[PDB]
């Protein structure tokens, strides 16, 4: 069985607020870049932030290929549109 064990991204709080329609870390705005993904077992994207850094991951049971691909595509489009560096 091919399973994705981790699809994790790290950002600063400012860039996350830029991407998440100005909303804080634990809440995913329905109009943001992390909304509109295919939901299989609930919220497909979960975000947290402790030390000024926001970690955004795909949910445990929502890590299909479509969600990962769409998250990567949206991160590209948001980063190059907002001139946010994608160091990786």
């Amino acid at each position: 069985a091919i399973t994705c064990t981790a699809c994790t991204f790290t950002m600063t709080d400012a860039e996350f607020a830029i991407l998440n329609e100005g909303v804080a870390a634990p809440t995913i705005d329905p109009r943001g870049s992390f909304a509109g993904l295919q939901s299989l077992s609930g919220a497909p994207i979960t975000a947290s932030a402790s030390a000024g850094t926001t970690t955004v991951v795909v949910a445990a049971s929502n890590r299909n290929d479509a969600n990962i691909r769409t998250l990567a595509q949206r991160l590209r489009r948001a980063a190059q549109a907002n001139r946010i560096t994608f160091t990786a």
Binding site: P30, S33, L37, Q38
Partner: peptide, 9 residues
């Protein structure tokens, strides 16, 4: 108003 729409594949 702007909506972030999903797609059916």
């Amino acid at each position: 108003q702007a909506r972030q729409e999903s797609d059916f594949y």
